[PDB]
Amino acid sequence: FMEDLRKCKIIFIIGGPGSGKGTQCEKLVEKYGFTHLSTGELLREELASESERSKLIRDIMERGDLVPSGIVLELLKEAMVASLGDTRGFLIDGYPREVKQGEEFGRRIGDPQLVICMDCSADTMTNRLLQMSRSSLPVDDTTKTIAKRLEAYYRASIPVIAYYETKTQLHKINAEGTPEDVFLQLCTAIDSIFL
Amino acid sequence: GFMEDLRKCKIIFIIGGPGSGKGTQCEKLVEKYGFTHLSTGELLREELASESERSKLIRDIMERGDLVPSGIVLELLKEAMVASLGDTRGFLIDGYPREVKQGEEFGRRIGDPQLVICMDCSADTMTNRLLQMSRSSLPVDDTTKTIAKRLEAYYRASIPVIAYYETKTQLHKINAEGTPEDVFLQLCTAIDSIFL
Numbered sequence: 001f002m003e004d005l006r007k008c009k010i011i012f013i014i015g016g017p018g019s020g021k022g023t024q025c026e027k028l029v030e031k032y033g034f035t036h037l038s039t040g041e042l043l044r045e046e047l048a049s050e051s052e053r054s055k056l057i058r059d060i061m062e063r064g065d066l067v068p069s070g071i072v073l074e075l076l077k078e079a080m081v082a083s084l085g086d087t088r089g090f091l092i093d094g095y096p097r098e099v100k101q102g103e104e105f106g107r108r109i110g111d112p113q114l115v116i117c118m119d120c121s122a123d124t125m126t127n128r129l130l131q132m133s134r135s136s137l138p139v140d141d142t143t144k145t146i147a148k149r150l151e152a153y154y155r156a157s158i159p160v161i162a163y164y165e166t167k168t169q170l171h172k173i174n175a176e177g178t179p180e181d182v183f184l185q186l187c188t189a190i191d192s193i194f195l
Numbered sequence: 196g197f198m199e200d201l202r203k204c205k206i207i208f209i210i211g212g213p214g215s216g217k218g219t220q221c222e223k224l225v226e227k228y229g230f231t232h233l234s235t236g237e238l239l240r241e242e243l244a245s246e247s248e249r250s251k252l253i254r255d256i257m258e259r260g261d262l263v264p265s266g267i268v269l270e271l272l273k274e275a276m277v278a279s280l281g282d283t284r285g286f287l288i289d290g291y292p293r294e295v296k297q298g299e300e301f302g303r304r305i306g307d308p309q310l311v312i313c314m315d316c317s318a319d320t321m322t323n324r325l326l327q328m329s330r331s332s333l334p335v336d337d338t339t340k341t342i343a344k345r346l347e348a349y350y351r352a353s354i355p356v357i358a359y360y361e362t363k364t365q366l367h368k369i370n371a372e373g374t375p376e377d378v379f380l381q382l383c384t385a386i387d388s389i390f391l
């Protein structure tokens with residue numbers, strides 16, 4: 001699996017809240033047949049399992065503490081190993097959270113052939129999030145809250161983006177257009193590495 | 196108003212390793228004393244379930260397995276305490292704080308605990324209890340290695356904090372190796388000794 005997992009299609013896709021990443025991942029899954037993974041879903045599944053390891057993770061999460069990179073990676077490797085054979089490739093959504101976690105992924109699993117960055121302005125992200133918002137607070141309040149959320153995304157993503165731009169595996173996609181036009185751009189990037 | 200109210204209310208921190216019996220003791224303390232039991236885990240769970248816009252920032256963080264900033268947890272804590280003030284006899288803050296600066300911040304922003312309870316239990320006893328509660332489908336060696344990591348994480352979180360509150364307030368170490376009913380007895384003794 002070491003050699004199999006390594007010599008196989010791995011795409012990271014990143015983007016802030018309101019970038020359209022969720023919907024585009026579904027479209028990509030539908031088109032390409034990729035295995036769509038994310039740490040949040042992997043953590044949720046593990047927590048539902050009653051394993052001793054899920055109890056460790058829960059001890060940590062209940063303190064608001066960081067879940068070590070190595071546990072997250074163990075969960076990815078297992079999901080990836082479970083999907084090999086019947087896979088057209090791996091779409092890892094929202095990963096990595098930090099450069100060192102990405103580096104460790106590279107060493108222990110495989111280097112992604114493509115890191116897609118869903119590039120989008122704060123204003124657009126904010127409008128999409130406002131539209132979906134269920135709060136009945138004043139819009140001013142809701143917008144300040146959304147702003148804080150974008151600001152924290154921007155601070156986590158910057159060094160990651162920089163790392164992959166420095167390694168030249170990053171494709172920036174203009175996530176501002178129609179869903180139709182964004183998807184085309186995504187497929188153009190994917191087809192350009194994997195053909 | 197709330198500021199001086201929060202500063203003068205009963206604040207007890209209770210710290211204990213997994214398998215120490217802390218959870219079940221807290222439920223009994225709440226029932227007996229009419230305290231409000233607060234924990235980070237439960238506060239986080241509740242914020243997330245609220246579906247508030249503010250909650251989505253925490254959801255982003257936790258989906259990466261990233262650390263939730265202390266300010267966010269403190270905010271949620273303060274809000275829980277303000278909401279319970281006037282229909283509670285005191286706060287039992289369970290497994291908090293996780294580091295010293297976070298405790299110092301609590302002290303400045305909310306109030307100083309009058310009592311820190313530490314539920315002392317050996318690693319061997321915590322390990323054995325946690326095996327008794329295990330649903331592991333893995334061999335006992337693998338299973339016990341993961342339990343050892345759970346204790347390691349507890350010791351990391353607890354040692355600096357316990358050492359700090361020893362210097363600052365009343366800290367009572369309870370022998371949690373006993374029966375749960377004896378542990379309850381000792382807890383009640385500790386609490387009664389402080390609140391008069």
Ligand SMILES: Nc1ncnc2c1ncn2[C@@H]1O[C@H](COP(=O)(O)O)[C@@H](O)[C@H]1O
Binds near residue numbers: 025026036
């Ligand atoms: N909360 C979630 N976050 C990220 N991915 C999810 C989530 N729930 C399901 N998925 C997966 O991501 C895509 C969208 O989710 P769904 O269509 O609800 O299954 C699917 O391809 C799922 O495999």
Ligand SMILES: [Cl-]
Binds near residue numbers: 017251
């Ligand atoms: Cl959202």
Ligand SMILES: [Cl-]
Binds near residue numbers: 316317318319
């Ligand atoms: Cl010991």
